[PDB]
Design a protein around this ligand. Sequence first.
Ligand SMILES: [Cl-]
Length: 307
Amino acid sequence: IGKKTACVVGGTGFVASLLVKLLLQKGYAVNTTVRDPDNQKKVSHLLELQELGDLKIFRADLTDELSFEAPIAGCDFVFHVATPVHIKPAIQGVVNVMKACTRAKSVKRVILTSSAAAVTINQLDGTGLVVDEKTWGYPASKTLAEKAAWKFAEENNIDLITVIPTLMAGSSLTSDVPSSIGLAMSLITGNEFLINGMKGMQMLSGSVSIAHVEDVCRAHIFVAEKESASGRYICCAANTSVPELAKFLSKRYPQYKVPTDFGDFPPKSKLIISSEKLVKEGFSFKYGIEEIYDESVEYFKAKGLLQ
Ligand SMILES: [Cl-]
């Protein structure tokens, strides 16, 4: 029967977890993976999801192409998030996984997540970053991992499609908060460091582009299900600037004090990131900027990271 199966590597992932939960709700039979099941806190959100449907964990490292044989087998779709909200490891992580998809008839299609943003963004979680008085890459650019994924796929006739996101906010199943929201939320949080971060985001990528992880997630499935889908799919809901965002947050969040004056800082960003191709192929974004921020704000408080 049309009893549908899919595999979602690295189930701990901010994006991934959310896929799984969401797949399960769609009826799919989900297999996911993780390095070491033996962090009780780590999987804590994964256990809860079992309640929703037939979720079979598997234990996987991106180092043994063997790991993937187990979880990958029987699944119509493989979802691997190449660049997780947190270089050589991913690039290897993407071949192995793809390797295993050669060794299965079941796998009708692979859909991969890579973005330049996350790459950078997780640098911001890095240690020893230099501060001056007064990295960031072309948003539509292809990570090596992505680039590597494409080559292979082409060489081994696999059916790949990639989803290219930007700033991802909303809420997350995972216990700890993701850098990426904190950054999306720094304007409300008032974290000076993260604001400069986001300020750079604008100059060095020349856009403040954002999306809700559920929407980024749906986008992944939809493309997975749409038989007519070919290629890369830039997924961003909102386009803005650090000033014009902070104005906008000020005039929707009286409860909080969002810095409303930048002086020199450019009011417009150089680039607008369009998900037309995506929309053109028929996706509709549930969450706009307003709902992204209510969502992100309401989670943060629920996280106990607000007043
Ligand atoms: Cl993620």
